[PDB]
Amino acid sequence: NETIVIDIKGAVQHPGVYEMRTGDRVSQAIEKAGGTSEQADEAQVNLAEILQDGTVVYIPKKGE
Amino acid sequence: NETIVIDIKGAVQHPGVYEMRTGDRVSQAIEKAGGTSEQADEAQVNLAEILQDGTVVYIPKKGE
């Protein structure tokens, strides 16, 4: 199969575990998770990294 | 398939994640992102580097 699961913790509206398509990107996970939280610092996160399976996508908070 | 996705952080008008054609250039990403910000320093960035997939394109600010 060509589906994937991802753990989306950090500064997002609905952190949790989501199922993505095999070739998706971090920017898609954040959208899948409702969207970014108003305390997030996306500058140090690569939003076009290919999502690997059974991995974490942490969205840092400003000042971390 | 022959498309690509790119992270455009830095001094641009619309930073974010954009989809480029496989053989595009940094000068094209900047234009796709609305254009340079009025605080950008184009001297320290190579504007015809081949865009690689799932990578960041940081546009420094003057004085960085």
Numbering used by the authors:
A (entry chain A), B (entry chain B): 59 to 122
Task: Quote the study that presented this structure, word for word.
To gain mechanistic insight into the function of ComEA, we cloned, overexpressed, purified, and determined the X-ray crystal structures of ComEABs and ComEAGs to 3.20 Å and 3.05 Å resolution, respectively. No electron density was evident for the ComEABs DNA-binding domain or linker region, but there was clear density corresponding to a previously undescribed domain (amino acids 60–122). There are seven of these domains arranged head-to-tail in the ComEABs crystallographic asymmetric unit, and we named this region the oligomerization domain (OD). More specifically, in the ComEABs structure, the seven-membered asymmetric unit uses the OD multimerization interface to form a 14-membered head-to-tail ring around the crystallographic two-fold axis. We measured this in vivo by comparing B. subtilis transformation in strains containing wild-type ComEABs; ComEABs-D111N, which disrupts a conserved intermolecular salt-bridge between D111 and R83 (corresponding to ComEAGs Asp113 and Arg85); ComEABs-A106Y (corresponding to ComEAGs-A108Y), which sterically blocks OD multimerization; and ComEA-ΔOD, containing a deletion of the entire OD, while leaving intact both the transmembrane region and the DNA-binding domain. In comparison to wild-type ComEABs, ComEABs-D111N reduced B. subtilis transformation nearly 100-fold. Even more striking were the ComEABs-A106Y and ComEA-ΔOD mutations that reduced B. subtilis transformation about 1,000-fold, a phenotype equivalent to that of a complete comEA deletion. As shown in, the A106Y mutation prevents stable DNA association with competence-expressing cells, which we have shown previously required uptake to the periplasm. To begin to understand the importance of ComEA sidechain interactions to DNA binding and ComEA function, we mutated some of the corresponding interfacial residues in ComEABs (e.g., ComEABs K164 and K193) to alanine and tested their effect on transformation in B. subtilis. Western blot analysis showed that wild-type ComEABs and the ComEABs proteins containing mutations in the HhH motifs were expressed to similar levels. These in vivo studies also showed that the K164A and K199A mutations caused more than a 2-log decrease in transformation, in contrast to the reproducible 2-4-fold effects of K193A and K197A.
